[PDB]
Amino acid sequence: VKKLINSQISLLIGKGLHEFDSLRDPEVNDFRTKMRQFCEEAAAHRQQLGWVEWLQYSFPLQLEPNRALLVNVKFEGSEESFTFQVSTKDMPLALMACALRKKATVFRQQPEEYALQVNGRHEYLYGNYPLCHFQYICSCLHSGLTPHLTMVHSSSILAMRDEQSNLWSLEQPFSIELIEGRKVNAMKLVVQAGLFHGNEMLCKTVSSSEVNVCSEPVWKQRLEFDISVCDLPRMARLCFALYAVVDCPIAWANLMLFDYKDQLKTGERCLYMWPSVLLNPAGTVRGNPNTESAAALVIYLPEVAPVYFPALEKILELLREILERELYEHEKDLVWKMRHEVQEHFPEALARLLLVTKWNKHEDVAQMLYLLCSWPELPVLSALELLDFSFPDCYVGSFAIKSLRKLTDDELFQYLLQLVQVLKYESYLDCELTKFLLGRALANRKIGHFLFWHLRSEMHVPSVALRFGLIMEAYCRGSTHHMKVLMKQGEALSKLKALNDFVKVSSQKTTKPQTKEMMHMCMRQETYMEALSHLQSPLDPSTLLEEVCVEQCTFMDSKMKPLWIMYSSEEAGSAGNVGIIFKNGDDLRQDMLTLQMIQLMDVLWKQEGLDLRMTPYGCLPTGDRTGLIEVVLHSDTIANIQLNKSNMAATAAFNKDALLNWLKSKNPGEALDRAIEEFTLSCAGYCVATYVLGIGDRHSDNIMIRESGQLFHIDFGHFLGNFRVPFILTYDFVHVIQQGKTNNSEKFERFRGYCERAYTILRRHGLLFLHLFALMRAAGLPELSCSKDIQYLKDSLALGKTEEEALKHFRVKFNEALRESW
Ligand SMILES: Cc1ccccc1-n1c(Cn2nc(-c3ccc(O)c(F)c3)c3c(N)ncnc32)nc2cccc(C)c2c1=O
Numbered sequence: 001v002k003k004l005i006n007s008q009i010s011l012l013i014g015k016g017l018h019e020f021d022s023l024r025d026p027e028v029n030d031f032r033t034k035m036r037q038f039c040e041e042a043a044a045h046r047q048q049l050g051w052v053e054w055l056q057y058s059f060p061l062q063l064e065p066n067r068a069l070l071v072n073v074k075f076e077g078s079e080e081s082f083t084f085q086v087s088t089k090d091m092p093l094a095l096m097a098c099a100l101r102k103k104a105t106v107f108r109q110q111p112e113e114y115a116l117q118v119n120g121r122h123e124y125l126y127g128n129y130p131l132c133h134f135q136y137i138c139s140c141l142h143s144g145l146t147p148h149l150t151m152v153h154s155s156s157i158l159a160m161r162d163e164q165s166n167l168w169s170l171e172q173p174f175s176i177e178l179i180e181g182r183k184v185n186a187m188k189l190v191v192q193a194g195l196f197h198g199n200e201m202l203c204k205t206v207s208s209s210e211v212n213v214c215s216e217p218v219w220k221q222r223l224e225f226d227i228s229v230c231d232l233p234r235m236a237r238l239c240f241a242l243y244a245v246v247d248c249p250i251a252w253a254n255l256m257l258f259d260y261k262d263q264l265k266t267g268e269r270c271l272y273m274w275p276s277v278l279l280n281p282a283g284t285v286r287g288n289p290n291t292e293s294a295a296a297l298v299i300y301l302p303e304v305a306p307v308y309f310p311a312l313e314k315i316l317e318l319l320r321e322i323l324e325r326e327l328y329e330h331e332k333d334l335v336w337k338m339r340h341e342v343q344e345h346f347p348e349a350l351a352r353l354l355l356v357t358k359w360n361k362h363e364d365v366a367q368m369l370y371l372l373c374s375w376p377e378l379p380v381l382s383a384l385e386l387l388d389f390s391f392p393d394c395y396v397g398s399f400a401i402k403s404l405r406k407l408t409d410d411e412l413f414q415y416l417l418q419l420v421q422v423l424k425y426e427s428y429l430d431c432e433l434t435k436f437l438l439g440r441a442l443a444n445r446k447i448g449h450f451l452f453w454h455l456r457s458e459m460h461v462p463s464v465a466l467r468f469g470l471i472m473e474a475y476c477r478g479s480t481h482h483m484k485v486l487m488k489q490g491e492a493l494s495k496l497k498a499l500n501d502f503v504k505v506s507s508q509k510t511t512k513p514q515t516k517e518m519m520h521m522c523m524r525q526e527t528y529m530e531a532l533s534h535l536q537s538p539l540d541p542s543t544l545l546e547e548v549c550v551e552q553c554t555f556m557d558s559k560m561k562p563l564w565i566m567y568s569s570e571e572a573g574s575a576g577n578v579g580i581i582f583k584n585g586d587d588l589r590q591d592m593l594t595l596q597m598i599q600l601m602d603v604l605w606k607q608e609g610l611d612l613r614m615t616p617y618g619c620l621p622t623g624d625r626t627g628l629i630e631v632v633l634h635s636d637t638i639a640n641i642q643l644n645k646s647n648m649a650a651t652a653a654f655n656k657d658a659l660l661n662w663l664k665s666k667n668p669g670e671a672l673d674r675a676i677e678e679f680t681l682s683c684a685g686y687c688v689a690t691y692v693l694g695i696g697d698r699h700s701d702n703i704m705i706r707e708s709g710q711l712f713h714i715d716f717g718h719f720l721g722n723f724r725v726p727f728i729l730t731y732d733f734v735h736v737i738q739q740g741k742t743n744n745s746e747k748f749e750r751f752r753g754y755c756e757r758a759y760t761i762l763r764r765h766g767l768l769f770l771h772l773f774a775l776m777r778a779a780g781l782p783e784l785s786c787s788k789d790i791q792y793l794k795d796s797l798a799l800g801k802t803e804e805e806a807l808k809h810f811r812v813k814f815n816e817a818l819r820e821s822w
Pocket residue numbers: 554555556557562563564581583591617619629630631632633635636637640704713714715716
């Protein structure tokens with residue numbers, strides 16, 4: 001059994017477990033055994049969970065951030081069902097009560113023994129919440145549809161559980177010996193070296209003597225640093241850059257001065273370098289795995305006596321306000337002078353005090369750490385700032401996680417993408433963040449699902465493949481069952497890649513109708529029908545993809561030729577008719593981040609009672625320029641609608657009426673008013689979202705509209721101005737908002753009110769967006785690479801202003817946009 005599981009993990013994670021063994025690396029070895037133990041203990045706890053707790057693990061509640069309604073309810077075993085009138089204010093228990101009373105009369109005669117499953121979905125309604133607090137019940141109300149639910153008994157739930165079982169002394173100036181290299185270039189070589197603690201230099205950047213671009217270079221020279229050995233902090237990073245000159249960067253390499261056991265490193269090292277894009281402090285502290293091709297630098301760390309970093313017990317032994325909300329040197333001195341008052345009276349200003357402490361003086365670090373160990377826990381918002389690379393110390397990182405433990409699963413999920421990116425800043429394999437993420441993932445299967453895919457989707461990136469592979473292995477140890485569920489998804493994705501490659505070849509030699517027929521024949525092979533059917537959606541593990549609907553599958557005969565894959569499910573009814581788009585060839589990371597930020601805006605708006613009728617559809621990178629996008633059904637592009645074709649319900653005398661005519665056709669009679677309202681609200685949401693994020697090149701081919709009237713955007717790829725993008729009002733959109741009238745200030749100014757409300761709410765959470773984007777810098781996105789990009793957000797939310805100034809500013813922009821509109 002154990003051999004089978006090992007091979008299944010290897011295949012699932014995209015890396016052979018023998019490759020971990022072959023490294024013969026104690027740190028890897030230790031990571032693997034500790035984390036396996038941790039994860040297996042979590043699995044043991046899970047298998048004895050009570051049935052309500054199991055539901056909470058496997059099917060966490062989907063909640064929203066009086067009135068009557070029809071609900072259809074059946075029981076798990078039978079066809080017979082009952083359609084009740086209940087209230088949106090009723091609890092699930094009351095609904096389960098009606099259900100059981102009804103079954104008792106038909107079937108000739110305890111609510112608390114049941115949970116309600118949404119038909120055809122891995123989604124359950126349970127707990128003390130009125131029905132309309134559940135996202136599913138909400139969804140039905142706005143769409144019109146009738147909730148269809150299944151009474152599931154506690155013994156059925158337990159059956160699912162059961163089937164799823166598994167030192168201060170050294171004053172000499174720090175120095176190294178640069179021995180030799182083995183590189184490729186055109187000039188003379190120089191090696192620049194610098195010592196870093198995060199972004200901050202611990203002293204000046206001492207450089208090599210120049211040597212000719214011959215060899216196999218040999219230096220054999222001591223590089224002494226302007227810092228005492230007893231002053232090197234625990235997280236000291238040594239950074240090299242090799243380049244040529246008469247500038248031409250060649251390569252870079254970093255390492256920690258202390259190993260993962262706090263021992264100071266000696267003696268000789270061969271550093272396998274990464275090819276360059278001069279110093280890269282944020283770059284990984286692990287060598288380039290391509291040891292065949294990589295340029296290499298051998299260095300020597302001299303034996304300073306074994307020396308370890310002191311234990312905490314030895315460490316622990318050793319106008320303010322007007323500025324406190326970049327600062328001058330005397331201001332910094334005051335903050336450090338007042339550090340005790342900072343702790344006692346301004347605990348949330350911890351980060352500011354950290355940025356003023358002298359990390360290159362061990363005495364000062366001791367004094368900072370002593371305060372840190374008695375520091376009260378901080379709000380989640382503050383802890384997110386502390387995860388930044390500006391805060392490299394392990395005690396700080398440990399404090400940060402401790403304050404983040406109060407994250408709800410919903411919050412953790414909202415920030416998961418960024419927390420995974422922060423792993424790229426980690427210095428060692430076994431770290432507090434990895435343990436935190438793995439623990440949360442093992443306690444919540446939705447978190448487990450998305451953590452898996454965030455890690456899996458980067459296995460083709462050599463710099464993270466080891467770390468991410470090891471995390472995925474450990475996770476698998478803690479849920480054998482979920483591993484198999486994930487394997488099924490991977491098998492479907494393998495088949496989709498093969499199918500997409502086929503379509504790419506066929507469509508170059510034949511017409512779209514012919515290729516589509518070939519696609520269908522390929523899909524109807526038993527191997528494909530089996531691999532593509534009966535899986536949890538990688539986009540949302542609560543959506544079950546049952547039978548693939550071959551005749552509705554197609555492809556886009558342009559660009560990367562993405563696939564359109566439709567599904568149906570008898571058991572789920574209408575809600576089982578769902579689609580996925582598979583695209584191979586594009587980097588989906590930018591799309592994913594944009595969509596996640598818009599989804600976050602939607603949550604923040606709804607928390608203030610503003611529902612802009614957004615369309616937060618799923619986008620999930622799964623592999624190398626590969627991923628899935630959730631299909632929004634019953635929608636069309638603005639461009640297609642504006643073609644204004646004849647013989648259609650929407651055919652118009654003036655082209656400006658095409659979109660309104662289309663909406664009229666989909667929403668006859670009294671339905672038009674609501675659709676125009678959905679259009680207006682969503683238009684405001686997307687106009688604000690794209691303005692704030694600097695998303696340019698919006699046009700009629702990348703905006704879509706649903707038959708409900710809701711507008712949404714597709715195909716992102718440009719943001720934070722990396723095409724200053726103006727606020728955009730489109731004439732055809734103004735025309736719909738104005739109900740097809742030339743002048744309609746009543747409707748138009750309501751729309752302006754929505755924009756202003758949305759904008760002011762985002763500003764209030766400005767710091768959250770800034771902290772999240774700061775963390776996202778870890779991801780290596782070319783459109784989020786520096787301070788200029790963060791500055792874009794600062795400017796767009798006008799955060800340096802009062803609310804009144806910001807709104808005047810926003811108003812000029814909005815007004816300028818209206819003029820520009822034809
Ligand atoms: C559905 C449609 C109407 C009008 C013009 C184009 C499309 N459309 C679109 C338009 N589109 N794009 C997206 C989409 C959104 C974000 C992306 O990153 C992305 F790659 C695609 C999309 C979506 N999520 N839901 C519904 N429609 C969407 N996408 C296709 C993808 C694969 C295969 C096909 C045949 C299509 C396709 O026909």
